[PDB]
UniProtKB/TrEMBL annotation, chain B:
This is DNA-directed RNA polymerase subunit. Zn(2+) 3 binds at C5, C30. The keyword Zinc-finger applies. Zn(2+) 9 binds at C73, C76, C101, C104. Zn(2+) 13 binds at N103.
From TrEMBL, chain E:
GO terms for cellular component: transcription elongation factor complex. Keywords: Metal-binding, Nucleus, Transcription, Transcription regulation, Zinc, Zinc-finger. It comes from the Eukaryota. This is Transcription elongation factor 1 homolog. It is found in: Nucleus. GO terms for molecular function: RNA polymerase II complex binding; zinc ion binding. Zn(2+) 2 binds at C11, C38. Zn(2+) 1 binds at C11, C14, C35, C38. Transmembrane segments: none annotated. Belongs to the ELOF1 family.
UniProtKB/TrEMBL annotation, chain G:
DNA-dependent RNA polymerase catalyzes the transcription of DNA into RNA using the four ribonucleoside triphosphates as substrates. It is found in: Nucleus. Belongs to the RNA polymerase beta' chain family. This is DNA-directed RNA polymerase subunit.
Automatic annotation (TrEMBL), chain H:
It comes from the Eukaryota. Residues 33-94, 126-178 form the RNA polymerase Rpb2 domain. It is found in: Nucleus. Component of the RNA polymerase II (Pol II) complex consisting of 12 subunits. Belongs to the RNA polymerase beta chain family. This is DNA-directed RNA polymerase subunit beta. DNA-dependent RNA polymerase catalyzes the transcription of DNA into RNA using the four ribonucleoside triphosphates as substrates. It comes from Komagataella phaffii (strain GS115 / ATCC 20864). The chain holds residues 541 to 737 of 1227 of the full protein.
Length: 294, 111, 97, 267, 64, 213, 48, 178, 49
């Protein structure tokens, strides 16, 4: 009986590289961050970061390091470049930079090439990458390389592609990211404005309800799996309707629309509260302003 | 301009041959060694000026957001050109404008 | 007014425009009539001022609370001295007079 | 914003030349501030060179490691700061001993060039250059980035007994370094004031720290035209300066007293 | 300077967890894994970006 | 050149040390306090211009007025160190020279710095009092500053009278650290009360009291 | 295991804001209001 | 929301080169093309491609919510078809120097008459004006490379001295505005 | 008169811009070219107002 209205949420755009600068008490000078999202469904997948280490006349080697999804330590760009497919330094520098007359970019990239020289092929590169990708003990080289390949394929930039045999696009995107970071670090281009409305998105009822329905459908799928794990050993044909509980999704939707807590009921913490609000019916102008509120 | 090797495709490094006493460019993954043509190895510019008038594009005239001026071109002498401030994002960048014609694409100031 | 756009403050002006009318100089008054650009600039200035006030009021309240908690057991005794609760002399005479 | 307000002597405050000389002698200047470009060359012949620009220079000056560090300075920066090649060469020698040669060019040339030679060394030269562009100091007090010459109007009693306005020249130096600034000759070592009371507590004492804190508080109060009685600010600066050191108005200085637990736990 | 660290790995012989010492020397690029129970020693060639996890994976690969 | 400014700084430090010794109550001749720079350069500097720190050490006795006021004031032996890095070799000789001539208070002045090892070799010379001071910290007399008032060391009788008048303990007075420059200028010890006569814009002259820790 | 559980319960009874480990949650989702949180805060005992 | 498959199809039909045939030693002046963030390819002559894309968007073959951005100073071509982009409608001013309609608005009194009547002279609402080619939607990013006018009277130069009304800006920094 | 004063202020701002864009503007002690230009423009506008 209560009139609830979903308030639009202002978030940052996906599949875009945003470059920012760090403070003085930090060994990092520039950080390029990008929250990648799939085109179908419009859900968040992961966030990739690339940090340039080295303060002004402090830090010796001015190397750049990337942070892969599900990793425990930073990996330089040369290692992931040699693990992607291009192992010669000439092809790497050709894909990254496009101006041979500028020597400042070459001098800034020289420490990275000097640090990432012990890796001369792709096998040892994948083996070293998989060791930091939250790997257990006992996977061995025969499976660690396959695990690192699966880590590099999916998760890492899924908006580009996900099928096999398409690493050239990923290498070109990484080279463009490194080139943009080096151009922003050379004081040739100002940092990206976080308050720019062009890089912002307004999620209304559509994507929010889609994510809620996806979470509820995943929960219902897990429940149906657990039910079939017990209603099969008896060797009896189920009536289908008895395996699908229509109360979970409805209760979750009602709770999320009445209390406003976006997420599960048992996980109220670390959740966005205030998505659904009580519709103000004091006057016409109040309702018109509440219907168009972000 | 730092060249690379044409065999294993890798960067070269400067070395001093003492038997002949000369500067050479030698690789680290193979045994390729070539003669050096420039004695300069490293150069660091403290008061540098690169990045001021280095980025020149050809489609700069199709931007309607750029204002126009009535400056005479030293080549074709056309009364249709654009002008813009220095693209160098430094805190001590001079406010001197640079003009670009829509024919020969030449950069000049008003000094 | 900072260049929120590409080398400009509003899309109705050209790039690299350092004129007063393109940087937040309201030429007209309240009786004449504020232009849309001047109206937007005045709205931005008022919003910035309101946000600054609403942010600084809490800081001033916290500063006053800290000063009160630091200076709360000070009392002038009958001997003319200014001591606290422990008896330590802060000033041998209140206001040095 | 750390800043020191330096007052000059009476015989110096009425002279602009001596004031400018003192400002130039106080202002910090390093080799990195005057260096315009650096290059690394390979010169196998120590008596000659490959570069044709410095050919007639070395051929007239002359009448180890083959690597050579060639640094080109800025003429305008070296002329505005009133610095010559001999002083820079002496300052480099006094810290390099005989481990690095120094060959300077004349000021009448087209470019101010200085050559250095060392009497795997590829990255060693880069490390030496990085160490030189971070520690070689020409002159000045460390910590004084910029100096501003300000005109101060002081009400001085005249010879007849009337107060008149007199214009003197003072300095405003960015950074904090009272211990090294007070020892500079030609500087009034009895009226120099600092805005940071932390350095005042270490240089002068707590009695001067109290006065500096009171002056800063009074200035902050009166900047916007407001006025507060002297007793309040006096009590405020006396409470903070009661234990001998600077007591903050946070949980670190207030809760570290010998008061009751019920009072300290209420904050 | 040689780096001597204590890891939480498990020995591939006596099956004792938290008893693996890794001694790395970058001057000669040599890693040594030792056990504090059955007392063994495994030598491996390391690099400038090596880690105890890398030499542990190398020992696992060499054991199989 | 640099030697001229070095000799000037040394003379300024010597004048500051003389003023400090005269402020503590020791008798200093009028011809020594008003010593010019030319006589200093002619007496201290040698043929090449290098000074001699061993030729600047002197001895001062307390004045009869200070002896009547303070009955615990003895001889003051001021000695300048010749070595820049004071180690365990010079400290032992200094302690031996102090204990041999039954010196009451000996002020030590170093050039560069003092290692933390020799810093522990100072309280072990009791009942003798040895105070260390840096040369760069003695170039400018901080007592002549405008913000630095005048401190007068009170006697035992005056301290007892003040404590009986105020009816308070020794832990209820404003304290001051021993490492304070104003406290080190007068050689303050634990249990001494100092009086400060300062200026106040509301009453003129103000008298305050502090206690050293 | 039972001794560690009893120690954790005793620790969470007096302080539920222990770092390095998750807090004790109730059957609804919100953590247990310990005795330490009753004193501190704006709506606590002394300041409330 | 609009899919990106027709955009990629149109780009491949026009003349977009793949990523396998890209080289900075040969393409040292081409313009990259970004579709929803991911890089698709490069083009040698983007001046014609951008014009054709704008014409197709104004015609009706492409959805009006598709944003087209051309960064000349950065040499980038962005085609945003994401969901949640805040856009606004704006009139279309003829900027092509090949007809007599330059300097004026594309919408005339005939469009107003057809809107008031509700039908064409052999439904007619707001969508008809968008599909015709007089009003186009622009977002926050497309507004960076366009020149908008406040009032239509500012589109043409005038020939006052009124102490009661407001004072219009002079705008004497630029010689001629487009 | 107010309109004439506003026009004179605009002309002065244009002259300051022309002097700054032609390396003919005096540099303030402790401030760069852009900072001094902005400060001078703000002071002129405040004085005109
Ligand atoms: Zn090779
Ligand atoms: Zn032309
Ligand atoms: Zn074992």
């Amino acid at each position: 009986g209560s009139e609830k209205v979903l308030i639009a949420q202002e978030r940052s755009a996906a599949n875009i590289v945003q470059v920012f600068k760090k403070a003085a008490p930090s060994p990092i000078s520039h950080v390029a961050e990008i929250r990648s999202a799939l085109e179908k469904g419009s859900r968040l997948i992961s966030t990739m970061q690339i940090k340039l280490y080295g303060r002004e006349d402090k830090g010796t080697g001015r190397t750049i390091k990337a942070t892969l999804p599900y990793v425990k330590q930073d990996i330089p760009i040369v290692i992931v470049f040699r693990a992607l497919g291009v192992v010669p330094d000439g092809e790497i520098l050709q894909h990254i930079c496009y101006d041979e007359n500028d020597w400042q970019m070459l001098e800034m990239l020289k420490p990275c090439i000097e640090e990432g020289f012990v890796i001369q092929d792709k096998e040892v590169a994948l083996d070293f990458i998989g060791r930091r990708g939250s790997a257990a003990l006992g996977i061995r080289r025969e499976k660690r390389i396959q695990y690192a390949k699966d880590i590099l394929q999916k998760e890492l930039l899924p908006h580009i592609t996900q099928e096999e045999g398409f690493e050239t696009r990923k290498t070109f995107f990484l080279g463009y990211m490194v080139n943009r970071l080096l151009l922003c670090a050379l004081e040739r281009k100002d940092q990206d404005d976080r308050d720019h409305f062009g890089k912002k998105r307004l999620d209304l009822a559509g994507p929010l309800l889609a994510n809620l329905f996806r979470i509820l459908f995943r929960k219902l799928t897990r429940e149906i799996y657990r039910y079939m794990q017990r209603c099969i050993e008896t060797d009896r044909d189920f009536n289908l309707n008895l395996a699908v509980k229509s109360t979970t999704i409805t209760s979750g939707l009602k709770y999320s629309l009445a209390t406003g807590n976006w997420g599960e009921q048992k996980k109220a913490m670390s959740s966005r509260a205030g998505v659904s609000q009580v519709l103000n019916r004091y006057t016409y102008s109040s309702t018109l302003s509440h219907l168009r509120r972000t | 301009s730092f060249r690379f090797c044409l065999e294993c495709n890798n960067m070269l490094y400067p070395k001093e041959d003492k038997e002949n006493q000369r500067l050479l460019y030698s690789c680290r993954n193979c045994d390729y060694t070539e003669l050096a043509e420039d004695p300069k190895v490293y150069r660091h510019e403290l008061i540098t000026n690169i990045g001021e008038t280095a980025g020149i594009v050809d489609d700069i005239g199709q931007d309607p957001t750029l204002p126009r001026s009535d400056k005479e071109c030293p080549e074709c002498h056309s009364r249709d050109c654009v002008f813009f401030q220095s693209q160098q994002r430094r805190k001590d960048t001079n406010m001197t404008l640079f003009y670009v014609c829509l024919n020969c694409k030449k950069t000049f100031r008003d000094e | 007014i900072a260049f929120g756009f590409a080398d400009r403050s509003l899309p109705h002006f050209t790039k690299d425009d350092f004129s007063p009318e393109s940087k937040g100089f309201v030429e007209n008054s309240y009786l004449r009539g504020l232009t849309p650009q001047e109206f937007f600039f005045h709205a931005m200035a008022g919003r910035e001022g309101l946000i600054d006030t609403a942010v600084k009021t809490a800081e001033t309240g916290y500063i006053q609370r800290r000063l009160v908690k630091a200076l709360e057991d000070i009392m002038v005794h009958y001997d003319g001295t200014t001591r606290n609760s422990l008896g330590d002399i802060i000033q041998f005479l209140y206001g040095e007079d | 914003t750390p800043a020191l307000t330096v007052y000059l002597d009476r015989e110096i405050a009425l002279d602009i030349e001596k004031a400018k000389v003192i400002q130039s002698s106080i202002e910090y200047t390093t080799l990195k501030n005057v260096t315009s470009a650096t290059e690394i060359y390979y010169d196998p012949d120590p008596t000659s060179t490959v570069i044709e620009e410095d050919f007639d220079t070395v051929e007239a000056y002359f009448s180890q490691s083959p690597w050579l560090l060639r640094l080109e300075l800025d003429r305008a920066r070296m002329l505005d700061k009133q610095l010559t090649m001999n002083q820079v060469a002496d300052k480099i020698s006094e810290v390099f001993s005989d481990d690095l040669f120094v060959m300077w060019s004349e000021d009448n040339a087209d470019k101010l060039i200085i050559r250095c030679r060392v009497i795997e060394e590829d990255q060693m030269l880069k490390r030496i250059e990085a160490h030189m562009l971070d520690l070689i100091a020409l002159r000045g007090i460390p910590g004084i980035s910029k100096v501003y010459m300000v005109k101060h109007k002081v009400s001085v009693p005249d010879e007849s007994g009337e107060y008149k306005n007199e214009e003197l020249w003072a300095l405003e130096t960015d950074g904090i370094n009272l211990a090294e600034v007070m020892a500079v000759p030609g500087v009034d070592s009895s009226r120099t004031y600092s805005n940071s009371f932390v350095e005042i507590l270490s240089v002068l004492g707590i009695e001067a720290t109290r006065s500096s804190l009171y002056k800063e508080i009074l200035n902050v109060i009166a900047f916007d035209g407001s006025y507060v009685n002297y007793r309040h600010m006096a009590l405020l600066v006396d409470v903070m300066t009661s234990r001998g050191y600077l007591m903050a108005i946070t949980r670190h200085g207030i809760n570290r007293a010998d008061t009751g637990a019920l009072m300290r736990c209420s904050f | 300077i040689k780096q001597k660290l204590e890891t939480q790995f498990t020995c591939l012989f006596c099956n004792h967890d938290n008893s693996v010492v890794c001694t790395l020397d970058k001057k000669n690029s040599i890693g040594l894994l030792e056990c504090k129970k059955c007392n063994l020693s495994f030598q491996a060639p390391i690099n400038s970006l090596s880690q105890p996890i890398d030499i542990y994976s190398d020992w696992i690969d060499a054991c199989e | 050149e640099d030697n001229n400014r070095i000799i000037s700084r040394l003379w300024r430090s010597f004048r500051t040390v003389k003023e400090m010794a005269a402020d503590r109550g020791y008798f200093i001749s009028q011809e020594e306090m008003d010593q010019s720079l030319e006589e200093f350069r002619s007496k201290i500097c040698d043929s090449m211009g290098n000074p001699q720190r061993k030729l600047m050490s002197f001895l001062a006795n307390p004045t009869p007025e200070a002896l009547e006021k303070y009955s615990d004031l003895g001889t003051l032996w001021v000695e300048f160190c010749d070595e820049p890095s004071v180690g365990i070799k010079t400290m032992r000789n200094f302690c031996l020279r102090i204990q041999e001539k039954n010196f009451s208070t000996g002020i030590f002045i170093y050039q560069n710095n003092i290692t933390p090892s020799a810093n522990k070799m100072i309280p072990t010379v009791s009942p003798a009092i040895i105070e260390t001071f840096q040369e760069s910290d003695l170039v400018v007399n901080i007592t002549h500053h405008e913000l630095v008032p005048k401190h007068i060391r009170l006697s035992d009788g005056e301290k007892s009278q003040l404590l009986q008048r105020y009816k308070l303990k020794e832990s209820q007075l404003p304290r001051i650290q021993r490492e304070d420059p104003v406290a080190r200028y007068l050689g303050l010890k634990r249990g001494q009360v100092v009086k400060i006569i300062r200026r106040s814009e509301t009453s003129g002259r103000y008298a305050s009291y502090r206690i050293c820790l | 295991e039972v001794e560690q559980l009893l120690q954790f319960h005793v620790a969470t009874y007096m302080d539920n804001d222990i770092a390095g480990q998750p807090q004790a949650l109730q059957k609804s989702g919100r953590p247990v209001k310990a005795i330490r949180a009753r004193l501190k805060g704006k709506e606590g005992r002394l300041r409330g | 929301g609009s899919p990106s498959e027709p955009i990629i199809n149109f780009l491949e039909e026009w003349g977009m080169e793949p990523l396998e045939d890209y080289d900075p030693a040969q393409h040292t002046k081409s313009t990259r093309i970004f579709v929803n963030g991911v890089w698709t390819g490069i083009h040698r002559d983007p001046s014609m491609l951008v014009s054709t894309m704008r014409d197709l968007r104004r015609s009706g073959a492409i959805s009006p919510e598709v944003s087209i951005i051309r960064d000349i100073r950065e040499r980038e071509f962005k085609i945003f078809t994401d969901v949640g982009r805040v856009y606004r409608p704006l009139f279309i001013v003829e900027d092509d120097e090949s007809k007599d309609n330059k300097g004026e608005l594309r919408i005339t009194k005939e469009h107003i008459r057809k809107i008031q009547q509700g039908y064409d002279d052999d439904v007619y609402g707001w969508s008809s004006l968008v599909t015709s080619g007089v009003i186009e939607y622009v977002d926050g990013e497309e507004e960076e490379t366009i020149m908008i006018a406040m009032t239509p009277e500012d589109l043409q130069t005038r020939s006052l001295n009124d102490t009661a009304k407001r004072i219009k800006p002079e705008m004497s920094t630029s010689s001629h505005h487009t | 008169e107010i309109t004439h004063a506003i026009s004179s202020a605009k002309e002065q701002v244009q002259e300051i811009i022309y002097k700054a864009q032609h390396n003919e503007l005096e540099l303030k002690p402790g401030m760069t070219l852009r900072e001094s230009f902005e400060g001078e423009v703000s002071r002129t506008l405040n004085d005109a107002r």
